[PDB]
Every structure is written in structure tokens, then in C-alpha cells.
Amino acid sequence: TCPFYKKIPGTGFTVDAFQYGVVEGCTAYFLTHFHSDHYAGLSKHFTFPVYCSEITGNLLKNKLHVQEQYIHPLPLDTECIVNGVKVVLLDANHCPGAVMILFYLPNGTVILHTGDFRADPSMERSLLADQKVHMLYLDTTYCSPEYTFPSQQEVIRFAINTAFEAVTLNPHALVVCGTYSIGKEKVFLAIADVLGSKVGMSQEKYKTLQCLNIPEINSLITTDMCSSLVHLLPMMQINFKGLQSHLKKCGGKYNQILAFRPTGWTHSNKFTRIADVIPQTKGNISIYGIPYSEHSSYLEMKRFVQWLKPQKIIPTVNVGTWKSRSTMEKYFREWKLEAGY
């Protein structure tokens, strides 16, 4: 059944709750972003109002064939009325089209649902600064102090420098990047830019990227693999067998592959700096795991919450085990006692 952390009290609303059938009492289904664990259940047969960003609504229409009459896109950073309730969509610094949702309940309670987010100090100057938030529905993916990672900028600098050096040493090397969802487009676009190439990909992935409102995108991507020296493949194909196989397909145009796997966190992060990352190599194939995250680190999450000073926190991630729930509640209390709210 629909869990309580997906329901907004005092409303008829749910968030990211499309896989439970008709939720009793739901008059509007909000969708924070287009990732499968969140949209699970939507299709062309859905006949309830879906509220989301413009970009998410482009993907619902083009990839899932949801009918236009049920898609309700909202502009960001704008006070809107939905079934008699004031709401605002804010940028979540996650994947393209991802939002946080502010609900202003008729009784005067204010609720923030972060969806999936990477907390940033820039959020402290959005419409969030203007009033008090009483309850926080929080993306707790990486809510433990072991989870450190570098900035997105540091990671992209490493990837660009690595790729440019490799291809300049060997003009016959191919660069491959893995993907299994939207998000993390900066990895493959920054590398293609430094090399003066478009990124080549499947027709299905090209279609997905053309929904994202990225500026000048027609200049950066292509379905012609032959004209491209940065290829995108499914994340599943980023291993020695899959890459050897792909190289055969390129017909002796290339004699070396340098491949990137943008993981979330990996336990090389506790010890190893970004400067010191090394690849796994077999023969003429090398694979780099890079820690490019679109979720908050522990310290980023803690800074946002200590800034916001919510009265009550409701985790939306890692809620399935008692040990995880108890650990998270301990951190929340630490943060509250340290900051004095």
C-alpha cells in the first residue's frame, strides 16, 4: 500500500506514488523527476492529473506516451494554485527537470518535499529564504558521515584533462561513457567539447536528450556513430567484454578505448583523492569509475538542514530497515542540538 512518507497531510496530494493503483483520496499526483523508481507505474492509460516541471512533462509525453490532457507542467520559482492549495516548484540540482515542492497548507503549515536533490548553498537564496518550513520530506540517500565526495566541477576537470591527454597521445583512441537514465549529461558533453566531437548514441537515447531543453543541443549530439569519437552506451556494456565487442563494431577506426563509469559513491572515496584515481586496465581497454554525484554528500545535507531548521524531518530514502531509520534519527538530533533549534 502507499507509504505515509509519500502522502502530504491536509491535502489530497501524493508525491512519486504511481505504482499503488488508485490511491484513495488522491486528487493530484506530483512527480519530482523522471527516474524509474519515481515514475514506476505511469503509462498512456493514466487518467489523473500529473503535476511536474516542463522538462519532466516533455519526457512523460514523448517517452511514456502519457496523454497531454493529463500533464500539467508548472514554471519554476512561481506561486501556483493547485486544487485550492498554493505550491511552488524549485530546482533540485539533481537531473534535468528535477524539482523540490513547497506546499502552503490552508492551516498555515509549510512543507518542503526535496524529491531527490544535491543540496547547495545557492538554495539558501531561493524562495525558501522568505518563510519558515515546518516539515521536511528529505532525500537521505547518503545520510552517513562516510559519504564524502568532490564537487561536480572537480570531477569534470579530471575527466576533461584525462580524455584530452589520452586522445592527443593516441588520435586513434575512442572515448566511451556509460548511462542508464537521465542525469550526469555534463560528463559526456564536457569531454566531447574538449575533443571537438559530437556525442554519438542510440536513437532511443538521442530522443530522450532532445526532451531536456539543453541550449544548442543540436550542435552537441548525434545518431551518426561513424562521425563521433565520444560514444554513449548502456552502463551494462561498460566492462571488458562489452567494450571489446563494441571496438570490433567500429571496423578498425580505433585501436584503444578509454571508458568512464559515473558511479554514485564507491569506498575508494574514504581513502583516495580525485587527483589519485586510477583505471582498471586489460590490454588496450581502460575503465575509470568517477564519483560524479547528483545527491547530497553527508556534509551538504547537514548544512542545508541546519540552515532550514525544520520542526520535523521525514526521510524518504533508506526507510526499509530499523537500523537505517534509527541511525538517521540520531544524526537529525545531533544536528538540532549542535545548531540550537
* Span interacting with Ni ion, options 4-12, 109-117, 131-139, 216-224, rule CB under 5 A: 109-117
Look up residue 341 and give its three cell numbers. 533549534
Complex with Ni ion: residue 50 or 95, whichever CB lies closer: 95
Q: How far apart are CA 123 and CA 9, in angstroms?
A: 25
Q: Minimal distance in Å, beta carbon 36 to Ni ion?
A: 9
- Show Cβ contacts of residue 73 under 8 Å, excluding neighbours closer than 6 positions: 52, 53, 54, 56, 57
Q: How many residues bind Ni ion (CB under 5 A)?
A: 2
Angle between helix 185-195 and helix 152-169 axes, rounded to 10 deg: 40
Closest CA to 178 of 54, 287, 42: 287
- Which CB, 35 or 184, lies closer to Ni ion? 35
Segment interacting with Ni ion, rule: CB under 5 A, options 80-88, 111-119, 125-133, 168-176: 111-119
Q: Is 16 in the site for Ni ion (CB under 5 A)?
A: no
CA separation for the pair 97, 212 (Å, rounded): 7
Cβ closer to Ni ion: 116 or 300?
A: 116
CB of 234 to Ni ion, least distance (A): 18
Q: Which is nearer to Ni ion, 60 or 257 (CB)?
A: 60
Please identify, among the stretches 27-35, 166-174, 192-200, 231-239, the one whose residues bind Ni ion according to the rule CB under 5 A: 27-35
Return the SS3 of 330: helix
Least gap, CB of 15 to Ni ion (angstroms): 13
For 12, residues 6+ apart whose C-beta sits below 8 A from its C-beta are 25, 26, 27, 28, 83
Q: In the bound complex, what is the minimum distance in angstroms from residue 99's beta carbon to Ni ion?
A: 12
- What does the alpha-carbon distance between residue 36 and residue 48 come to, in Å, rounded to a whole number? 19
Smallest distance, Å, CB 271 to Ni ion?
27
Print the binding letters for residues 144-173 with Ni ion: x by CB under 5 A, - otherwise: ------------------------------
Q: Does residue 300 bind Ni ion (CB under 5 A)?
A: no
Per CB under 5 A, 35 contacts Ni ion: yes
Q: What are phi and psi of 152, to 5 degrees?
A: -60, -40
Binder of Ni ion out of 17, 39, 51, 116 (CB under 5 A): 116
Write the CA distances from 300 to 92, 305, 338, integer angstroms.
13, 9, 16
Q: Which residues bind Ni ion (CB under 5 A)?
A: 35, 116
